[PDB]
């Protein structure tokens, strides 16, 4: 399309030379939660359609956390084209994160690098926010809309399975899916809740929870984990989440490391990076967890998606639906239908009925 040219040669460019991304991103939220977004041209066939988590979702591709970090563009975002949308992370308190700059453009990269530490309005604030659109809600998650909420820990909590119970009775009824997100790279000791005995006192009390809110305010809860898990760290995860009935994992966070090859002059910002060079990061870490637990648990794929092409590599690697965030920054809103539109042509190129015939295939 038009579109997608003048965002990604125009409009995009344009945007990143006049204002630092913490700025810009600030404008889009605002921008998005008022509509103000080209025409989403493309219309979701039922090939895109995918039942999974207790959920019809219209389409399998999502605007990933961090994006609306405190619930202010949800209907924006499915304005955009988004089959499904999370928000978050949400923290207990309130709480401003780390000190400005706090991320950075790799324009040379197509990636990003953030540190933002859990900036968040808290649980109280969001709460408010999706009470007052929750009925709407239900109407869009039942027309294949779905919403999820990922939740965090504050900084100075003493207690982090707390935190997330905490999430779990405040955010819960509003969720189609919860989050435990133990992978962000930028909360001190976070990731350490990845390993074995962590997860599985945190995860059993996150799910005694969950499963203490009425039926039809009880959402799915998933995992979201590191892409810089060792193979014990993959195995264990894998093992607790069989062992207890987790719901579902998202893969991947943003990377720590810092692949070789990375140009931008901003490569050594401590963060975690994020856009191309996580992609096959991530694509290899859904594989591995996919045949971990033997294709019984669905994953959400994430990381570096910006093409139809990356789409089903991370549906056929054992992905049931995928994510994006860090393409917008670079090609905008039209990136969206672009994924679609490519990943409906390579389905029927490769002689799938739909996405659900492609989920896991390589592994077939
Ligand atoms: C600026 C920024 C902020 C993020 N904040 C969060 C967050 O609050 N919670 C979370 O689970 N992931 C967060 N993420 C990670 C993304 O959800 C996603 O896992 C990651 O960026 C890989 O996808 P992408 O390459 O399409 O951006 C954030 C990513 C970026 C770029
Ligand atoms: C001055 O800023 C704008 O014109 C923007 C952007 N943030 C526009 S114009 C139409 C549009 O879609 N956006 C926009 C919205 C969300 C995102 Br993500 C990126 C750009
Ligand atoms: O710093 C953040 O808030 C954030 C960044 C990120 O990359 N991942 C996440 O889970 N949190």
Redo the contacts with the bound molecule.
Sequence with gaps: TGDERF?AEH??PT?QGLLDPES?HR??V???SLG???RARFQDSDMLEVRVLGHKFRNPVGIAAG?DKHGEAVDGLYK?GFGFVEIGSVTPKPQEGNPRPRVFRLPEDQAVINRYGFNSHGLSVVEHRLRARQQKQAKLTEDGLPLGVNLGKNKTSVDAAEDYAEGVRVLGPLADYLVVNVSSPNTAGLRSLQGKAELRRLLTKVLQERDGLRRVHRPAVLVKIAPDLTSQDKEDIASVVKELGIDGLIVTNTTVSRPAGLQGALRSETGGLSGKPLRDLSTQTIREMYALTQGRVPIIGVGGVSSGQDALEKIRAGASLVQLYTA??FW??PVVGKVKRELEALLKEQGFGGVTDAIGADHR
């Design positions: 965002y409009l995009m945007l810009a404008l889009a605002r921008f998005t103000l977004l080209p994006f955009m917008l920054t905008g809103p």
